[PDB]
């Protein structure tokens, strides 16, 4: 069957920590007082929660309340434990409190409020310097959570909040995040379609932190080339075809061969044969101001089929693309 794989960094972080760190099921939630929070307005509703802007009336500060849906109790405890483990980490959203909602009778996560700039506005206006600056800020968050034995698994534009005024970034929505345990087989039905790593698309379950680096590469490609999303699949199958049209089918088949993966036969009639396109093929007069040889070399090293061959977050932070960013 498939050949096993393990992360090339932070492999045994969870083995060397007490069981309390990663055994989220045995975690006892410390409950705050729901009366401290007054809901102001509904911000949205996803598949697992309803999100509200609120005020913490004990300090008159703005907060965000995520009222969880009454499903998957283990999922709730996993997110809480991950948020708690990462609290205070660079560019990680701060979990301020956990309260029992009086209406839903489910847990409600209270986060620090980020006065975030519109996502469309962010994509349309970031300069070359700001893409490098913000990419470096995302890498601080990823290296931290990976160093803490956690993979985010849902890295995408909507989960990266930027307060462009204070040049502040926060990585949010840790509801799909997981503890990395070498040898563990994970659910491939994670991340959003356009940001899914080839490991997910070919149904390779023994993946690791490097899935987040593929997602980050998809963001980078969309930002530097002004193509939202960069890999625009009609569904999860066409998603791999879109990748193959850029990276080529030869390296895809080498990746499937190496890990001894049984590719879904439905790909036989749609993958075709494609050669890698040189990154300069995607450069045009409307995006040339965001492209440099350093941007292309950095992107090239993130968007690789073989998850073991991608730059880790720390290696990515050493890249020449970031030499111009003030540190
Ligand atoms: N800490 C926070 N500070 C400010 N706004 C937040 C915070 N956490 C979440 N939000 C905002 O609350 C809303 C949550 O609603 P929702 O999850 O449905 O939107 P979304 O970003 O389109 O999600 P997705 O695209 O992942 O499905 C979003 O507009 C999000 O930007
Ligand atoms: C993460 C995500 C999850 N999504 C669903 C469940 C549990 C479940 N099984 N059947 N219905 N609900 C779950 C657990 C964790 Br950890
Ligand atoms: C860092 C965080 C970001 N949150 C949203 C965007 C916009 C976008 N669209 N496609 N990829 N990114 C964004 C850009 C940077 Br750099």
UniProtKB/Swiss-Prot annotation:
GO biological process, one term: positive regulation of cell growth
Cellular compartments annotated: Nucleus
Catalytic activity: L-seryl-[protein] + ATP = O-phospho-L-seryl-[protein] + ADP + H(+); L-threonyl-[protein] + ATP = O-phospho-L-threonyl-[protein] + ADP + H(+)
Tissue/organ expression: Expressed in gastric carcinoma tissue and the expression gradually increases with the progression of the carcinoma (at protein level).
EC annotation from Swiss-Prot or TrEMBL: 2.7.11.1
Keywords: Apoptosis, ATP-binding, Biological rhythms, Cell cycle, Disease variant, Intellectual disability, Kinase, Nucleotide-binding, Nucleus, Phosphoprotein, Serine/threonine-protein kinase, Transcription, Transcription regulation, Transferase, Wnt signaling pathway
Protein kinase domain ranges (all copies): 37-322
Active site, renumbered: 154 (proton acceptor)
Modification after translation (UniProt): Phosphorylation does not directly affect casein kinase 2 activity, but may contribute to its regulation by forming binding sites for interacting proteins and/or targeting it to different compartments.
Positions of the UniProt region annotated as Interaction with beta subunit: 34-39
UniProt GO MF annotations: ATP binding; Hsp90 protein binding; identical protein binding; kinase activity; protein serine kinase activity; protein serine/threonine kinase activity
Binding site for ATP: 43-51, 66
Enzyme class, UniProt record, top EC level: transferase
Further details from the record: Can use both ATP and GTP as phosphoryl donors. Phosphorylation by casein kinase 2 has been estimated to represent up to one quarter of the eukaryotic phosphoproteome. Casein kinase 2 has been found to be increased at protein level and up-regulated at the level of enzyme activity in the majority of cancers. However, elevated levels of casein kinase 2 are present in certain normal organs such as brain and testes.
Complexes and interactors: Heterotetramer composed of two catalytic subunits (alpha chain and/or alpha' chain) and two regulatory subunits (beta chains). The tetramer can exist as a combination of 2 alpha/2 beta, 2 alpha'/2 beta or 1 alpha/1 alpha'/2 beta subunits. Also part of a CK2-SPT16-SSRP1 complex composed of SSRP1, SUPT16H, CSNK2A1, CSNK2A2 and CSNK2B, which forms following UV irradiation. Interacts with RNPS1. Interacts with SNAI1. Interacts with PML (isoform PML-12). Interacts with CCAR2. Interacts with HIRIP3.
Linked pathology: Okur-Chung neurodevelopmental syndrome: An autosomal dominant neurodevelopmental disorder characterized by developmental delay, intellectual disability, behavioral problems, hypotonia, speech problems, microcephaly, pachygyria and variable dysmorphic features.
Protein name: Casein kinase II subunit alpha
Organism of this sequence: Homo sapiens
Covered range of the whole protein: 3 to 329 of 391
């Amino acid at each position: 069957g498939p050949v096993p794989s393990r992360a090339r960094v932070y492999t045994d972080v969870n083995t060397h920590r007490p069981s309390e760190y990663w055994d989220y099921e045995s975690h006892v939630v410390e409950w705050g007082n729901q009366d401290d929070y007054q809901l102001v307005r509904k911000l949205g509703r996803g598949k697992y929660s309803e999100v509200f802007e609120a005020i913490n009336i004990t300090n008159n500060e703005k907060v965000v309340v995520k009222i969880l849906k009454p499903v998957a109790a283990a999922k709730i405890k996993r997110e809480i434990k991950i948020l708690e483990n990462l609290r205070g980490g660079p560019n990680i959203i701060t979990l301020a409190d956990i309260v029992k909602d009086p209406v839903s009778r489910t847990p409600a996560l209270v986060f620090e409020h980020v006065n975030n700039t519109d996502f469309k506005q962010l994509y349309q206006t970031l300069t070359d310097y700001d893409i490098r600056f913000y990419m470096y800020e995302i890498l601080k968050a990823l290296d931290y959570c990976h160093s803490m034995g956690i993979m985010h698994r849902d890295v995408k534009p909507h989960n990266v909040m930027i307060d462009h005024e204070h040049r502040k970034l926060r990585l949010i929505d840790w509801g799909l995040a997981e503890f990395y345990h070498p040898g563990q087989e994970y659910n491939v039905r994670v991340a959003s379609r356009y940001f899914k790593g080839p490991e997910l698309l070919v149904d390779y379950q023994m993946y690791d932190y490097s899935l987040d680096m593929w997602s980050l590469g998809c963001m980078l490609a969309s930002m530097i080339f002004r193509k939202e999303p960069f890999f625009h699949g009609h569904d999860n199958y066409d998603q791999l075809v879109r990748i193959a049209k850029v990276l080529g089918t030869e390296d895809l088949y080498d990746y499937i061969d190496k890990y001894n993966i049984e590719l879904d036969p439905r790909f036989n009639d749609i993958l075709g044969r494609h050669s890698r396109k040189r990154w300069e093929r995607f450069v045009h007069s409307e995006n040339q101001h965001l492209v440099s040889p350093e941007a292309l070399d950095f992107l090239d090293k993130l968007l690789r089929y073989d998850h073991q061959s991608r730059l880790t977050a720390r290696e990515a932070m050493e890249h020449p693309y970031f030499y111009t960013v003030v540190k």
